[PDB]
Amino acid sequence: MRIKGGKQTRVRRKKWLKQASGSFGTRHASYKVAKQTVIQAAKYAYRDRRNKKRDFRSLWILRLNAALREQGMTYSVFINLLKKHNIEINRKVLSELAIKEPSKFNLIVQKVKS
Amino acid sequence: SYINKPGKTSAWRVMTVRQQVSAVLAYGKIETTLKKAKNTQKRLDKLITLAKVDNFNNRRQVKKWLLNTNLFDVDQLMDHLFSKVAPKYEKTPGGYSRVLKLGPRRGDATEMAILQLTD
Amino acid sequence: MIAFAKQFRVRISPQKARLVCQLIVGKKTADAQNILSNTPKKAATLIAKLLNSAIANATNNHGMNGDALYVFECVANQGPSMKRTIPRAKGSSNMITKRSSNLVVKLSDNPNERQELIKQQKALVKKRVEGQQKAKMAR
Amino acid sequence: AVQQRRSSKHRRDKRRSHDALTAQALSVCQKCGKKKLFHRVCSCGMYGDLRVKKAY
RNA sequence: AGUUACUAAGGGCUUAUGGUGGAUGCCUUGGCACUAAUAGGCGAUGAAGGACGUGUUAACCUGCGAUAAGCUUC
RNA sequence: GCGAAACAGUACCGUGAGGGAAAGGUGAAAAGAACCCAGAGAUGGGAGUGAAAUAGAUUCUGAAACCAUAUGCCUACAACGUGUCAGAGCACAUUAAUGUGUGAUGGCGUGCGUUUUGAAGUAUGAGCCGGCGAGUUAUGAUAGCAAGCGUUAGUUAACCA
RNA sequence: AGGGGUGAAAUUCCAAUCGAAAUCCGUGAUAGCUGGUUCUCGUCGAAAUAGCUUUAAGGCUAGCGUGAGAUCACAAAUAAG
RNA sequence: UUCUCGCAGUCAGACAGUGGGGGAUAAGCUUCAUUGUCAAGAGGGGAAGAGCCCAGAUCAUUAAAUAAGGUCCCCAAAAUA
RNA sequence: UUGUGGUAGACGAGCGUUGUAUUGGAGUUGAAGUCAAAGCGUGAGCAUUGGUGGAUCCAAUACAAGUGAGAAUGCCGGCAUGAGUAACGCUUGGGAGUGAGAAUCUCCCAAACCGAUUGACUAAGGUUUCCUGGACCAGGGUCGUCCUUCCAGGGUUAGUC
């Protein structure tokens, strides 16, 4: 009862190598190497998915504090102004996108006056 | 190094030069490697220069620069030279022979060239 | 416009013929003969006959103009090789490969058929998508 | 001394890039229809246009 | 003076064309295990087995044996 | 699968005892590429038989590793286990979908198994690719779950139809 | 002619190899030492401590983890006294 | 964290703190007990660091409060006296 | 409500392939295999389509595995790499002719080496490597028109050795 699994192994390696593409040179030509490349790429993609949300808030803090200190006030001042009175849910990204919205940031700065 | 080919030293080259000048005197045209023609041109021109005078001292001198062939002997080549070739080139100051670059050899693609002479 | 001619792997290494034919590829036929005659290579002799046979086939069998023909592309493929043994010092043996190369050439009479193959592939993918989408019509 | 790691196809091709050859020379012979390279004889029995040998 | 056209000797990515290798897929005058009946030796009248020879047919396999790739009786 | 489907203990090796090879598939009928051209021929191209020559004797197909080839894009101030998250622009248009290819440039990032307290490791193995490649069975016991029977029942070893 | 021969002796040679040649078998000898051991997923999930050992690389028992059952608050912990 | 049952696994630990001994309160050293970590579990701070600090990760978020820790720039992150 | 770090290790639930067996279907109006493209899946996998392809399969269920390949300094086979790199393993030229093709073929000429040798009778051995005609796929460390290479035809003769 000889049982051959050549076709099964070939199909498995084919579907494994189908994921790997666009590598450097011959790297997307070896099954064993491409396996490690795919696994490492997946792990690093998970890491980037975990940390991009971590760094985007800091990016928006930079991009908004630029405008704030251009008006003569730190990002800390804006956070305090939001904190004590008239607490808003407007996100740091959306408040950063208000820069992309013309004639809007002035409305916020005049509104937060107290 | 230890036992190997004996090489192609300058003595072998000059012996081949004597052989080839004898051959070209016998025929008047020789096809071979260009580099050897370049070296043998000077000696051939000197022999032609010494062939104009036909003096027994000069005969003895040129005796040291011929060989034995089947077309003619050393004496036969010498007398044929001194009879007809000597007054042929008595009017030009050198440049009695011309080397023309032929096509590369089949074997090692050596640049072939033909040495020829005419009036 | 191909007029291909094959020789089916005479003994020649690809490393030696690839560069020279790519140097000669992409030009007319007469100048190709002139430069190949002035080429001190075994590849020159091996390819002169192939070029002449290809020109003859294009003119006679294919009826091509010949005056507008040019060498379309080199394809110097992996021809089957030979394995031999050689004595080696200290009483050993070594294996050496005698390499050969599949010989085949293409000739184009037009500045195209590079994009015509693209048209053929486009028709092929269109028939593919047609076969895929008409399956959705079985509702 | 010996090679430690095997090279790559692209790297070996970049190395072999200098193995490529340049174009040859080509001159024109008028009386004998032929494009013979420069400072060479003509197969029609001549060198350049000066007849010096047999037509071979 | 400042931006990139244009550069690529060559290489890389994407796409397919052709080439080697017979991998995979399909099959089997082959091997393997058996099932049930027989049988369990040959040979000095010189065995099996080899070498040799034999053909309109060179050589191999095979058949046979100078009566020789075969005969006689039924 | 017998080493041996193939003229196999043949080829071959060691003096020699002895050890010990690989390989099957045209096609339906050769119905074997007639005729012509280049070429000394081989070979190739037309041409024909043949449904088919993606069936041409390398004759069921022709995968992977490998070799080129070019569509389009990018690369010659460039310190990256070579990629990720993005992304200008370019060329396209699919199992039509925030599409695909590709990336000037920004952020981030020192392989796989291995055994050790442990390796990006200057610890070891791995060039790659394709197949193949290593916890079965015979009996007996124990444990778990289910069942049959079930308070002298269950069950046959062997043997026979 | 190999628990043999041979050896102006050196553990020399015995088919380029020999503290005792090669060949086939017992034998698939043995390997506390190396190396490897090929589908997916879910849940729980320690130790490198102790004793013994012709014993320290190993092996046996404990403790520990895990799974099934029961105990199920008198048991066990966490705080207060 | 009780008992029984089945399957185990580990003894070649290391590091940091405390109390030590030996060594020299020399050694990233040895021997110990205790408190935590890695082993067997990643992350941020710590210039990058298995055992230090904060801390215990189903997955997706271009959402918020934060811990350690930090705010001239590289590099998000404040000033007054 | 606890939740979804985890090696060893425990436990549970499934998937893929072959064959057998029953119920089915497709198939020269194209099956499988193969390659490709821009799908579905928690994953074992399932597809869909294009074409090679030219006759086999797939779907549902139990039973049984030469059943599930990432390494074993794994077995074989193929392929690069190194790399046009060292070497070509004790050596010249000219003429004429042939040859499609001349450093390598033939003939002639020379030059050079040994000459108690690079001489010759002949043994062991090789066991036809011998000769002629034709040719040069397989080897000639390139070369080949030639070779001790291949085919065809011949060839060693004893009373005194």
Coordinates of C-alpha atoms (C1' of nucleotides) in Angstrom, one line a residue, chain G residues 11-62:
Chain G
rU11 C1' 55.2 -2.6 16.9
rU12 C1' 58.5 -3.6 9.6
rC13 C1' 55.5 -5.6 5.8
rC14 C1' 51.5 -8.7 4.3
rA15 C1' 48.3 -5.4 -2.9
rA16 C1' 49.5 3.2 -2.3
rU17 C1' 46.1 1.6 3.7
rC18 C1' 47.6 -3.1 9.6
rG19 C1' 48.9 -3.1 18.0
rA20 C1' 47.3 -6.6 13.9
rA21 C1' 44.4 -7.2 5.8
rA22 C1' 40.1 -7.7 3.1
rU23 C1' 35.7 -10.3 2.1
rC24 C1' 30.2 -12.6 3.8
rC25 C1' 27.4 -13.6 8.1
rG26 C1' 26.0 -13.7 13.3
rU27 C1' 24.5 -8.1 13.4
rG28 C1' 19.7 -4.3 12.1
rA29 C1' 26.0 -5.9 17.7
rU30 C1' 25.9 -1.6 21.4
rA31 C1' 25.5 3.9 21.6
rG32 C1' 23.3 7.0 29.9
rC33 C1' 26.5 10.1 24.1
rU34 C1' 25.4 13.5 19.0
rG35 C1' 22.2 14.5 15.0
rG36 C1' 16.7 14.4 13.0
rU37 C1' 11.7 12.8 13.2
rU38 C1' 6.6 15.4 7.8
rC39 C1' -1.6 18.5 9.0
rU40 C1' -5.0 22.7 11.7
rC41 C1' -7.2 24.8 15.9
rG42 C1' -9.1 25.5 21.1
rU43 C1' -8.1 25.2 26.8
rC44 C1' -5.0 24.6 31.0
rG45 C1' -0.2 25.0 31.6
rA46 C1' 5.4 23.8 36.0
rA47 C1' 10.8 22.6 37.4
rA48 C1' 16.0 23.3 37.1
rU49 C1' 14.5 21.8 44.1
rA50 C1' 15.0 17.2 47.8
rG51 C1' 16.4 12.1 48.8
rC52 C1' 18.8 7.6 46.6
rU53 C1' 22.3 5.5 43.1
rU54 C1' 29.4 1.6 40.7
rU55 C1' 26.2 7.9 41.3
rA56 C1' 26.9 13.2 39.3
rA57 C1' 25.5 13.9 31.0
rG58 C1' 22.3 9.3 33.1
rG59 C1' 18.4 6.5 36.0
rC60 C1' 14.3 5.7 40.4
rU61 C1' 10.8 8.1 44.0
rA62 C1' 8.8 12.9 46.0

